[PDB]
């Protein structure tokens, strides 16, 4: 949960 | 996977 790759802000799922 | 809370760099599991 956070920034980077996975879920959150950044890349992957959630907000880009 | 990344920075923030969860697994990676930052808080939670992995590297602090």
Three-state SS string across B1-16, please? Answer: CEEEEEEEEEEEEEEC
Which of A2, A5, A10 is nearest residue B10 as measured by Cβ atoms? A2
Question: Is residue A14 within 8 angstroms of chain B, CB to CB?
Answer: no
Are the beta carbons of A1 and B5 separated by less than 8 Å?
yes
Rounded-to-integer distance, Cα A6 and Cα B4, Å: 11
Q: Which residues pair with B10 in a beta bridge?
A: B4
Question: Is residue B3 within 8 Å of A3, Cβ to Cβ?
Answer: yes
Any B CB within 8 A of A2 CB: yes
- Structural method: NMR
Nearest CA in chain A to B8: A4
In three-state form (DSSP H/G/I as H, E/B as E, the rest C), the secondary structure along chain A is CEEEEEEEEEEEEEEC
């Amino acid at each position: 949960v956070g920034a980077x790759a996975x879920v959150x802000w950044x890349w992957x799922w959630x907000w880009x």
